[PDB]
Design a protein around this ligand. Sequence first.
Ligand SMILES: Brc1cccc(-c2cc(NCc3ccncc3)[n+]3[nH]cnc3n2)c1
Length: 292
Amino acid sequence: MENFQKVEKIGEGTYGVVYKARNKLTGEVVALKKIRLVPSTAIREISLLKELNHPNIVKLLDVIHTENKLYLVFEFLHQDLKKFMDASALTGIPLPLIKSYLFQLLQGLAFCHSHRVLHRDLKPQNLLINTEGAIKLADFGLARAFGVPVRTYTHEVVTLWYRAPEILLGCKYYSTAVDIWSLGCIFAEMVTRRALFPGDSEIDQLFRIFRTLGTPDEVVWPGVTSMPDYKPSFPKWARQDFSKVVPPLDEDGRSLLSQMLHYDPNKRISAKAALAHPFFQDVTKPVPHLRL
Ligand SMILES: Brc1cccc(-c2cc(NCc3ccncc3)[n+]3[nH]cnc3n2)c1
């Protein structure tokens, strides 16, 4: 830590305070993350993430285990998508830019997933943008390392808006399809300028999902009725047309959103397959209008 000078508190993450900081020797400007509670297991797992390098993954520069505390030093980026969407509310992110960002995030998932590494807590606050038209995933792999708590260290509620339904139904064993689902929800949110499923508890989240996509059953999701927190007593809602759910998204876009939104995680499109989807045939890399 003494090798850093804290420029400023950026905010309060899942695990702890996030600082913008300068390496007190090397000049480099970085994101510094203190991790609350170190266990041998988390070290070895964190250390596997330093090698998981990709242009659409926020680079983990260094892990520091000293004084029995744990800091993570990250490539610094100046804005997240949550804030960028807020800034863009009056007219929406232009579709060519939504496509570029989606395309790039799928590239980063496709990388991590091929090495068997999931995010598990994708969300706008976790997706970070620069002035070059790029977008990157933060905190990849940290959920397996440390868990995902209900409240942060500052009791701030961790949002459920982007959580896949197999998790909400108590499935113990997640696959990579959970990130696809989150990303699907983020994709719908960029398009409509409104969160898809803003639940404020687990059941409100589940039921919000149900009301839009239909209560899942053994037809669409084999094995569903036998998941840990499934209850025969769930209300049975009918599914809504996607045309109602995300206008004015185009046919290709709606078609892809649907596959990213499949109940059965096994049926849910992979990142790699999704990059091949006709939605992305005219993809480009526009530069965002950023005010820092
Ligand atoms: Br709080 C919180 C929760 C999850 C991720 C991050 C960030 C933000 C960020 N920069 C975006 C901002 C946001 C606001 N002010 C300055 C930079 N990062 N750069 C590199 N890792 C980062 N992790 C912060």
